[PDB]
Design an enzyme around this catalytic site. Structure first.
Site, PDB file in Angstrom:
ATOM      1  N   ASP A  25     -57.763  -2.489 -30.816  1.00  0.00           N
ATOM      2  CA  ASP A  25     -58.790  -1.545 -31.281  1.00  0.00           C
ATOM      3  C   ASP A  25     -60.111  -2.237 -31.552  1.00  0.00           C
ATOM      4  O   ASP A  25     -60.265  -2.869 -32.620  1.00  0.00           O
ATOM      5  CB  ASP A  25     -58.282  -0.866 -32.563  1.00  0.00           C
ATOM      6  CG  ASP A  25     -59.150   0.278 -33.046  1.00  0.00           C
ATOM      7  OD1 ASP A  25     -60.334   0.282 -32.699  1.00  0.00           O
ATOM      8  OD2 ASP A  25     -58.641   1.223 -33.693  1.00  0.00           O
ATOM      9  N   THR A  26     -61.059  -2.107 -30.631  1.00  0.00           N
ATOM     10  CA  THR A  26     -62.366  -2.755 -30.839  1.00  0.00           C
ATOM     11  C   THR A  26     -63.169  -2.076 -31.943  1.00  0.00           C
ATOM     12  O   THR A  26     -64.181  -2.647 -32.405  1.00  0.00           O
ATOM     13  CB  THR A  26     -63.170  -2.737 -29.519  1.00  0.00           C
ATOM     14  OG1 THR A  26     -63.272  -1.392 -29.068  1.00  0.00           O
ATOM     15  CG2 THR A  26     -62.418  -3.519 -28.450  1.00  0.00           C
ATOM     16  N   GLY A  27     -62.773  -0.882 -32.361  1.00  0.00           N
ATOM     17  CA  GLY A  27     -63.387  -0.141 -33.442  1.00  0.00           C
ATOM     18  C   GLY A  27     -62.994  -0.631 -34.834  1.00  0.00           C
ATOM     19  O   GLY A  27     -63.651  -0.283 -35.839  1.00  0.00           O
TER      20      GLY A  27
HETATM   21  C1  LIG Z   1     -58.543   0.297 -39.133  1.00  0.00           C
HETATM   22  C2  LIG Z   1     -59.594   1.414 -39.067  1.00  0.00           C
HETATM   23  C3  LIG Z   1     -60.037   1.709 -37.659  1.00  0.00           C
HETATM   24  C4  LIG Z   1     -61.067   2.841 -37.492  1.00  0.00           C
HETATM   25  C5  LIG Z   1     -62.393   2.461 -38.178  1.00  0.00           C
HETATM   26  C6  LIG Z   1     -63.536   3.459 -38.057  1.00  0.00           C
HETATM   27  C7  LIG Z   1     -64.680   3.025 -38.729  1.00  0.00           C
HETATM   28  C8  LIG Z   1     -65.532   2.094 -38.149  1.00  0.00           C
HETATM   29  C9  LIG Z   1     -66.707   1.675 -38.755  1.00  0.00           C
HETATM   30  C10 LIG Z   1     -66.971   2.089 -40.060  1.00  0.00           C
HETATM   31  C11 LIG Z   1     -66.157   3.064 -40.634  1.00  0.00           C
HETATM   32  C12 LIG Z   1     -64.994   3.488 -40.003  1.00  0.00           C
HETATM   33  C13 LIG Z   1     -61.219   2.986 -35.980  1.00  0.00           C
HETATM   34  C14 LIG Z   1     -60.186   3.723 -35.393  1.00  0.00           C
HETATM   35  O1  LIG Z   1     -60.018   3.468 -34.078  1.00  0.00           O
HETATM   36  C15 LIG Z   1     -59.511   4.778 -36.018  1.00  0.00           C
HETATM   37  C16 LIG Z   1     -58.641   5.663 -35.370  1.00  0.00           C
HETATM   38  C17 LIG Z   1     -57.598   5.060 -34.446  1.00  0.00           C
HETATM   39  C18 LIG Z   1     -56.661   4.051 -35.090  1.00  0.00           C
HETATM   40  C19 LIG Z   1     -59.180   6.789 -34.750  1.00  0.00           C
HETATM   41  C20 LIG Z   1     -60.478   6.815 -34.267  1.00  0.00           C
HETATM   42  C21 LIG Z   1     -61.009   7.960 -33.642  1.00  0.00           C
HETATM   43  C22 LIG Z   1     -60.274   9.129 -33.516  1.00  0.00           C
HETATM   44  C23 LIG Z   1     -58.909   9.100 -33.884  1.00  0.00           C
HETATM   45  N1  LIG Z   1     -58.205  10.254 -33.839  1.00  0.00           N
HETATM   46  S1  LIG Z   1     -57.405  10.567 -32.421  1.00  0.00           S
HETATM   47  O2  LIG Z   1     -56.864  11.972 -32.389  1.00  0.00           O
HETATM   48  O3  LIG Z   1     -58.417  10.347 -31.253  1.00  0.00           O
HETATM   49  C24 LIG Z   1     -56.212   9.280 -32.388  1.00  0.00           C
HETATM   50  C25 LIG Z   1     -55.035   9.446 -33.098  1.00  0.00           C
HETATM   51  C26 LIG Z   1     -54.073   8.436 -33.140  1.00  0.00           C
HETATM   52  C27 LIG Z   1     -54.273   7.280 -32.366  1.00  0.00           C
HETATM   53  C28 LIG Z   1     -53.368   6.239 -32.526  1.00  0.00           C
HETATM   54  F1  LIG Z   1     -53.278   5.410 -31.501  1.00  0.00           F
HETATM   55  F2  LIG Z   1     -53.830   5.470 -33.537  1.00  0.00           F
HETATM   56  F3  LIG Z   1     -52.198   6.700 -32.934  1.00  0.00           F
HETATM   57  C29 LIG Z   1     -55.457   7.156 -31.633  1.00  0.00           C
HETATM   58  N2  LIG Z   1     -56.414   8.185 -31.628  1.00  0.00           N
HETATM   59  C30 LIG Z   1     -58.434   7.978 -34.543  1.00  0.00           C
HETATM   60  C31 LIG Z   1     -59.800   4.904 -37.391  1.00  0.00           C
HETATM   61  O4  LIG Z   1     -59.331   5.821 -38.118  1.00  0.00           O
HETATM   62  O5  LIG Z   1     -60.677   4.099 -38.027  1.00  0.00           O
END
Ligand SMILES: CCC[C@@]1(CCc2ccccc2)CC(O)=C([C@H](CC)c2cccc(NS(=O)(=O)c3ccc(C(F)(F)F)cn3)c2)C(=O)O1
Ligand SMILES: [Cl-]
Ligand SMILES: [Cl-]
Ligand code: NA
Lengths: 99, 99
Positions: A25-27
């Site tokens: 996760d690059t995020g």
């Molecule tokens: C450890 C925290 C990671 C993160 C941080 C965000 C952030 C960044 C900068 C400052 C503040 C906050 C980025 C991230 O990818 C997600 C998640 C995935 C783990 C995320 C991001 C975007 C949308 C979703 N919802 S979804 O329906 O597209 C989804 C649901 C589940 C998954 C699974 F792989 F994690 F299960 C992936 N995608 C989730 C998240 O909730 O927060």
């Protein structure tokens, strides 16, 4: 390797002698792992995601293999939908994003 | 380009006529943008991440320009703490993870 993103970028990791699946996760600033036992002391941390904040246990200097690459660094343990490998260990394995 | 992950992978996007900053997130299934208006029809959705779920508005067939590359797909809008470009649009610009 070169990983495309048509499916979730899930890899095998090895931590505490156990194999697990984790999401690259690059995020994510940090590496977040589902409840498990790790050695040593932990420190408190609050981390933010899209649905708000969670409290985690921060363990430093943990040995973790990621897709066959060795990393040694900080892992946090807490409620998470999936095991997440964030940038602190993606940089250790030399990962880049390319387009 | 080649983006290292020492820092957050933030890029400029254009959406709905507005320039914004957004995070390239290989861990996100979907593209999630902070509250703004977009044209056309939408429907309610719930999306989950670290911290739990948030309610969003889902808009389909939205065009975004991401670091100069055009892509079209579904965008969801809601109370995210940051704009996130997820896999559904990262694939369209040919983004890969490499190590
Ligand atoms: C450890 C925290 C990671 C993160 C941080 C965000 C952030 C960044 C900068 C400052 C503040 C906050 C980025 C991230 O990818 C997600 C998640 C995935 C783990 C995320 C991001 C975007 C949308 C979703 N919802 S979804 O329906 O597209 C989804 C649901 C589940 C998954 C699974 F792989 F994690 F299960 C992936 N995608 C989730 C998240 O909730 O927060
Ligand atoms: Cl889409
Ligand atoms: Cl491809
Ligand atoms: Na539409």
């Amino acid at each position: 390797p070169q990983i495309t993103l048509w499916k979730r970028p899930l890899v095998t990791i090895k931590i505490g002698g156990q194999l697990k699946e984790a999401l690259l996760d690059t995020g994510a600033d940090d590496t977040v792992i589902e409840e498990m036992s790790l050695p040593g002391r932990w420190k408190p941390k609050m981390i933010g995601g899209i649905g708000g904040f969670i409290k985690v246990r921060q363990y430093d200097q943990i040995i973790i293999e990621i897709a066959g690459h060795k990393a040694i660094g900080t892992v946090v343990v807490g409620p998470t939908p999936v095991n997440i490998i964030g940038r602190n260990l993606l940089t250790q394995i030399g990962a880049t994003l390319n387009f």
